Each structure stands twice: as C-alpha cells, then as structure tokens.
Design a protein around this ligand. Structure first.
Ligand SMILES: OC[C@H]1O[C@@H](n2cc(-c3cccc4ccccc34)nn2)[C@H](O)[C@@H](O)[C@@H]1O
Length: 810
C-alpha cells in the first residue's frame, strides 16, 4: 500500500501464506474452523520469527569469527512493548505480511492488537534501554542487553471511581513466541554465607544457591540483517533445595520470587531486601556469562579491550565489586591490576539528581546478604579516600562528603559514589543535566577526576517512534527526500526547504488529522468516550510525579473552565486535554493527582455551558503501545517539569518527531530541542534553573502567589470548599496543603507565565497554515534526537568502538 513498508512480491506473499498455514496446523494444532483471533496472531508471529533465525545464527557466528569488542548493557529494566510490527519493519516484511494476511481474509492490524506489551520497565529509564538495543543493532555493534525476565512487568492500571487500581501484568499467560530458553547456560548465583580467610586469600562459604536460567530475545537491526541478543535471567531453585517433603517443594518459591515482579517505583528509594537480591542476581549471572564468553574467544590485561559494561543507573552497581571479587578471589589477580581492569571496563549513566532517588543501602543488609562484597567495598573506599586525601590535603569535610560509606543513624553505602570511583566514564543524559552533575551533586568527584565526566544527550529510535507508529508521516517525508533518513535522521533538515511548499503543508496537516480521527475512534471503540477531533489535542503522558507537574496542567485546565463560565458566549479555541500515566502504588500524592484529574473531568465534561469546547480525559493504562497511538495524534506536547528536575526526557523527542508543538520549561533536553528548532518555534515559559536557585535562597512562599493572583485564589478556593468533590468536600485537602505549605517544585511560581504562554498556543492554532509551518520546522530539526546519534557517541567516546552501517549477507 505505502512505500516505506517494503515490497509485496509475488514469491514472498505466496511463501508467507503457506508458512502461516503450516504454523496454524502444525504449531498451533488448529484449522480455520476452530481458530481464534489469538491463534491467528500466533501463526503470524511464528511466520515472522522464522525470518529472524537465519540472521540470528549467522550474526552470532560472525561475532565469534571476527571477535570484536563486546558491549554489555546492564539494566534492571527493558521497556520493549510489542515485538511483531517492529520485527516486520526492520526486516522489510510489513507490506508482504499485510498482503498475505489480507488474502487469507484477515486484518493484520487487528492481529497486532492481540500481542501483549513486554512491560519490563517503569518509564523513561526502561524505554531508553529498549531504544538503545535497537540503535546498537542498526549500527552493527556486537551488543548484548542483560536484565531480568520478570514474570510480572509493570501493573495494568484500571481506573475505578476515579482512583487507580493495580492488577498483575500476567504477560506470559499465553506464552512468549519471541523468547528462546537457553537452559544449557544455567548459572549459579550465591547469597548469604560468610567469609573465611585462608593462607591463600579470602573464601566465600556456606552460601545459598539460586540458579539463573537465561532466555534469549532477538534484537533485529534496521534492514542490515544484524540480529543481536537481549538475554534475560530467570530464577530457579536447585533440585536439592530444602531437601516435611511437601513443604520443602513448596518453599522453592522463596528462591524463585527473585525474578517474579518488577519494582514499580519511579519515585522513592526503597531499601527492600528482595530488590537488592534482584540487583545482585542479574549482576552475578551476567558477569559469569561475560567472562565465559571472553575465555571461549588467562590474560585479563586485554579484558577491557574486548569488554565494555554499561551500567544503566546504579541498579547494577554491584558489577564493580563483583568483578573485583571474581578477579581477586577466583582468578588470583592482585588488587591493583584487578582494579585497573574494572575501571577500564565499567561506565556509569545517571538519570536523576533527586536525592530521594539515590540508592543508599544499609550496611547491615549487605553484611547479611553479601558479606564479601561489603569487605571489597570498604577496601575500595579506603584506597579511594587515600587518593582524595593526597589531592586535597587537610580537607576533612571533603573526605566525608566523598566517602562511599555514609555515617549516621544507620550506616549506608552510597552506590553512586561507588559507580564514579569504579568507572572510567560517568555521563548525564542531557547537556544541562550533565552540567548540573558537575556543579552540584558530583562536584567533589568532578574536581578529583574531571576527565571521567561526559554528556550523552538522550535519543529515541525513529523506527518504532516514526515508521512503526506513524507510517503516514514517514511516507510523505519519503516522497520528498527518499528513505535514507530512517537510519540517518539528520537528513530531515532537507525538509526545511519545503516549509513554504503548499502541497507539503497540506500533507503534513492531512496526516495529523487522519491520526486524530483514528485516535478519536479508538477512544470510543475501546473506552466509549466522545471527543471532538477538530479541537487541539493537548497531551501530557508520562509517569505521575510531583516534579513533572501534572498539577500545573490541572491548574491551567481549571483556569480555562472558569474563564468559559465567566464569559460563556466568548469564542475559545476548543481543546481536548489528555493526561495519562501510572502512579507508583505507594506514592500517595501521585494517586491523589490521578483522582483530581478524573474529578476535574467529571465537572468539565458534563457542563452544558462548556459544550465540546473543553474536554478533560484521563488516558488509562499508559504504556508503550498506547504511546504509539496517542503521540502521532497530538498537537501540543506538555513538558512542564520544574527547571532542573527532568534529567532529559524522551517523550518530548517522540512528540517533536511526530508533528506536535512543545510547551515546556528550559529543562532537560527541552533546551537542546529549542536550540535545534529555534526558540521562535518552541513555547518556552517559566523559571530557568538560575531563577529556581534565587527563589530557594530567598525562600519559596506559595502564599505570595495566592495573595497576588485572583484567578489562582479562586482555583484553590474551589479545591478546598469541595467544588470538585461534592460528596467529600475535603477530599483534596492534601493537595492544597502541599501546594500552600510544602511544594518542592514551585507549581505557583510558574502559573502566570504558563497560562500566558498557553494563550499564545491557542492564538497560533487559529491559523492552521502557520501552525503547520512551525510543525515542519520542528520535524526538520528533530534529527539530533535519534538514539543512533546517542549510541554512536557512546561507542566512540566511551566504549571505544566504531559503528558500521554495512549489511551482513542475507
Ligand atoms: O535517561 C532516560 C530517562 O530516565 C528517566 N528516569 C528516571 C527514573 C527513575 C528511576 C528510579 C527512581 C527515580 C526517582 C525519581 C525520578 C526518576 C527515577 N526513571 N526514569 C528520567 O527521569 C528522564 O529525565 C530520562 O529521560
């Protein structure tokens, strides 16, 4: 049908049709008479999967023969979403499979909707890992994703009476056709025990053993025949575990609970023992596998020349003392050589400056669970503080600030300090975030070792985030500039010469309208809610957190409603305001914000005076596959975090690529986005980081804003008096109290500029042609934000490897 989706050749369609019928019969044990739509999806999944295997076997064979430097991306989260359409896209099978299934009398899009998201992540940090795997394969790097195969991913979010309810995400219920179990690579992981000192070094004895069984998922590059591996560990009890008899067998679940469920915290460091076990489990199993593969290529001097380990936050930070443990205790290298290998192998990426997010493990926990690693950490710290003392003589406070061991009520290990000390490179995820790291939380470390500190601005994959989710836009772009931009997103600059092109202007606008119509229908068909597709689609989608200021959005929405009620017969640009995201189950305020949003909607959506001029919708169960639907449909992207709090953002980049304009603060990657597009083409408002600092020194007094802004006072009075909760007048007392007395993120301080800037958005929207030309200027300058660029920078400046766009033989 459309060009970017590949050729539908006669030979291919015939072959796909027959393999589909073979799988339906032989693999699913069905015929067309009793086959469910789920069987049809599975037959298609198996057909497409067959096209991966040849390439997967010869990519891994290629890496054995060539022996390149291997990249190991260690993460507790891989937010993958669905695999079927992405596989077709990267293999150029999409039109062919579409045609083949059409001829079989099936609708492929309906079949695609049956696949469960692999929801093995919470939000931005997990999705980054997934975009990274895609870019690494596309750039022909010998890269492996390593994580945990959770039985249950992020919870499915249900909204009942306006409240979030969580339910278990049983994503493996019907089976996962994309994974291949590799039980021949099952590995032992040790916990507890104690340390014995012999004549010949320390020994870790009396341990409990949990087995780690790997499951391999293919990661196909874009049209280059490269298929890399994401290896995920599953916990298994050994067969003599606890071995009355029945209880012993039932108790096996204690060991296997390690890989049962993803921790759903996007907010507040929870020092739970099960989480620590998860962190060590993935680290211990991965390092054994890395070393095994290294040996199967004695000499550990060359180890860093053949191995790079990237740590996705501090979650796999135990890789540092674990590598030391293996090298010193098992391989009998001396400390200094082992440490040199470790530093040169490891690199650390930070994703937040919020103090409550930092991992600070109680010493008594590491004492019990990992006695040897605690000893190694103490030795690391001692030798590190000796270096600090020699560089800054007499600076006793610097020593205690930089210590990996924090003294207090309970002694803690600071895992971020561990990571910096044990890594040859430390990076932030956007230029401003990376500067904030050097100036504030890691200032002392930067002064000691300035060369370790880097920036690597985040990116998103244009395969999933344009071609897959927005074929219409990819096609009109391809019509003018060809197809090469899909793996070379900088080529989108060539679209700047079409900004005054009347045909292109009309096409860009047409595609958006089609996307909005399709999404407006999806809402009714799946959720029975009626929206006006001619309104401006104002969308804020991301995890619910106070720093992200969904509450500032709420205040604007209430302002618009009150202004309508004040002057009913005045014209206003119609808006559909969509807010979506999950709240961490124990985050009370985040759960209150969800309830506020639905409560606002209850009032706004049923006011006869309002009509269809304003709608407030809460997007339930936001996740990767819903993002693929709503993002192409958006006109306005809300990126309104308090300056200095959003490390980068990646949702922002998705919206920019898909033809939405951005309203945002100068925070994270918004700064670089505005810089690329030009500030005239961006809706910037609010305090800069400097302004936040000034307010903090003086003291933030919310009351001042309440007293001086009559429209704000009215909103707070409506919330307090029970205007949005008639049966429970004091329901939102917590929200008001927080806003008035302990708002860390200064919601009121940005309110005036925000509302004013929102008016400028509505003004532009009244002029479709000038709205669309500004959109073109955004899409055209979005090229920097491809994770292909990000990964090439990691590759060259951290890992020491050269990317390749060359095909492997088919
Ligand atoms: O680098 C990729 C993205 O990572 C995001 N992120 C941060 C976190 C995160 C994990 C664990 C605890 C956290 C606590 C507070 C804020 C974020 C947390 N999860 N995702 C960052 O919040 C976002 O700015 C960035 O674009």
């Amino acid at each position: 049908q459309i060009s970017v989706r590949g050729l539908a050749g006669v030979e291919n369609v015939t072959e796909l049709k027959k393999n589909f019928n073979r799988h339906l019969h032989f693999t699913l044990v069905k015929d067309r008479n009793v086959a469910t739509p789920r069987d049809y999806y599975f037959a298609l999944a198996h057909t497409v999967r067959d096209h991966l295997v040849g390439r997967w076997i010869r990519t891994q064979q290629h890496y054995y023969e060539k022996d390149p430097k291997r990249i190991y991306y260690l993460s507790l989260e891989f937010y993958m979403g669905r695999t079927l359409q992405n596989t077709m896209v990267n293999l150029a099978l999409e039109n062919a499979c579409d045609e083949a299934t059409y001829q079989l009398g099936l609708d492929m899009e309906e079949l695609e909707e049956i696949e469960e998201d692999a929801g093995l992540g919470n939000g931005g940090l997990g999705r980054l890992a997934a975009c990274f795997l895609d870019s690494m394969a596309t750039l022909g790097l010998a890269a492996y994703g390593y994580g945990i195969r959770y039985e249950f991913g992020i919870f499915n979010q249900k909204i009942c009476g306006g409240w979030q309810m969580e339910e278990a995400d049983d994503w493996l219920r019907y089976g996962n056709p994309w994974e291949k179990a590799r039980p021949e690579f099952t590995l032992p992981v040790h916990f507890y025990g104690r340390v014995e000192h012999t004549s010949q070094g320390a020994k870790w004895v009396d341990t409990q053993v949990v087995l780690a069984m790997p499951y391999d998922t293919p990661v196909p590059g874009y049209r280059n025949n490269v298929v890399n591996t994401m290896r995920l560990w599953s916990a298994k009890a050994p067969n003599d575990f606890n071995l009355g008899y029945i209880q012993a067998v039932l108790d096996r679940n204690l060991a296997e609970n390690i890989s049962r469920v993803l921790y759903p915290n996007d907010n507040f460091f929870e020092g739970k023992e099960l989480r620590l076990k998860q962190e060590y489990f993935v680290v211990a199993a991965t390092l054994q596998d890395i070393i095994r593969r290294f040996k199967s290529s004695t000499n550990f001097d060359a180890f860093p020349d053949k191995v790079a380990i990237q740590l996705n936050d501090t979650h796999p930070s135990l890789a540092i003392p674990e590598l030391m443990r293996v090298l010193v205790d098992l391989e009998r290298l001396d400390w200094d050589k082992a440490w040199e290998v470790t530093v040169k192998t490891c690199a650390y990426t930070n994703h937040t400056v919020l103090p409550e997010a930092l991992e600070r493990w109680p010493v008594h926990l590491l004492e019990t669970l990992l006695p040897r690693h605690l000893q190694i950490i103490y030795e690391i710290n001692q030798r590190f503080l000796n270096r600090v003392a020699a560089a800054f003589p007499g600076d006793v406070d610097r020593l205690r600030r930089m210590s990996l061991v924090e003294e207090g009520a309970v002694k803690r290990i600071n895992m971020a300090h561990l990571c910096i000390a044990g890594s040859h490179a430390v990076n932030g995820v956007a230029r401003i975030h990376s500067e904030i790291l050097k100036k504030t939380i890691f200032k002392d470390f930067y002064e000691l070792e300035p060369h370790k500190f880097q920036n690597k601005t985040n990116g998103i994959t244009p395969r999933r985030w344009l071609v897959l989710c927005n074929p219409g836009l990819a096609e009109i772009i391809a019509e003018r500039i060809g197809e090469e931009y899909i793996s070379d997103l900088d080529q989108l600059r060539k679209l700047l010469s079409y900004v005054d092109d009347e045909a292109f202007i009309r096409d860009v606008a047409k595609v958006k309208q089609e996307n909005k119509l399709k999404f407006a229908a999806y809402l009714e068909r799946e959720y029975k809610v009626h929206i006006n597709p001619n309104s401006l689609f104002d969308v804020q989608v991301k995890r619910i957190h106070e720093y992200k200021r969904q509450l500032l959005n709420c205040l604007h929405v209430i302002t618009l409603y009150n202004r309508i009620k004040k002057e009913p017969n005045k014209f206003v640009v119609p808006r559909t305001v969509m807010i979506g995201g999950k709240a961490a189950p124990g985050y009370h305020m985040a759960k209150m914000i969800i309830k506020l949003i639905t409560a606002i909607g209850d009032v706004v959506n049923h006011d006869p005076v309002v009509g269809d001029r304003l709608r407030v919708i809460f997007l339930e169960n936001y996740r990767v596959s819903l993002a693929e639907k709503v993002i192409p449909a958006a006109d306005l992207s809300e990126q309104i975090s308090t300056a200095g709090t959003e490390a980068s953002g990646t949702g922002n980049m998705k919206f920019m690529l898909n033809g939405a304009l951005t309203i945002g603060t100068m925070d994270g990657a918004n700064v670089e986005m505005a810089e690329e597009a030009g500030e005239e083409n961006f809706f910037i408002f609010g305090m800069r980081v400097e302004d936040v600092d000034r307010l903090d020194q003086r003291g933030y007094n919310a009351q001042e804003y309440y007293d001086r802004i009559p429209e704000l006072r009215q909103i707070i009075e409506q919330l307090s008096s029970g205007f949005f909760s008639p049966k429970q007048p004091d329901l939102f007392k917590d929200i008001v109290n927080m806003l008035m007395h302990h708002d860390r993120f200064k919601v009121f301080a940005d309110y005036e500029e925000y509302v004013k800037c929102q008016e400028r958005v509505s003004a532009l929207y009244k002029n479709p042609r000038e709205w669309t030309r500004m959109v073109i200027r955004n899409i055209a300058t979005s090229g920097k934000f491809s994770s292909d660029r990000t990964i090439a920078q990691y590759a060259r400046e951290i890992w020491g490897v050269e990317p390749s766009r060359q095909r492997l033989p088919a």
